[PDB]
């Protein structure tokens, strides 16, 4: 219920994948929160060369 | 769960047709399993003719 959206949870064998569960996802589209890697200044620019 | 498509189990009466239950298909594409109209060579061939 009030779900935008539901990812696949499936379990990976040898030969086949197969799908158990669904992990519903609320989301709304915005700044306040980001993703990172990992835990550490987020903010790093390479200038004068392709990146 | 796991289910790409369902079909739609209906009853119907002299009237109208009304669904009751969900019958859920899990389906890969490909030619190892074929459905026949009945049990029994696959292989009829009609040349010359329209077919």
Redesign the interface.
């Known amino acids: 219920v009030g779900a935008n959206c539901k990812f696949d949870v499936a379990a990976r064998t040898r030969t086949n994948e ?5 992990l519903y996802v609320i989301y709304e589209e915005g700044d306040n929160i980001a993703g990172v890697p990992s835990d550490n200044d987020l903010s790093v620019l390479h200038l004068d060369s392709c990146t």
Do not use: A, H
Request: proline share 0%.
């Open positions: 197969q799908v158990v569960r669904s």
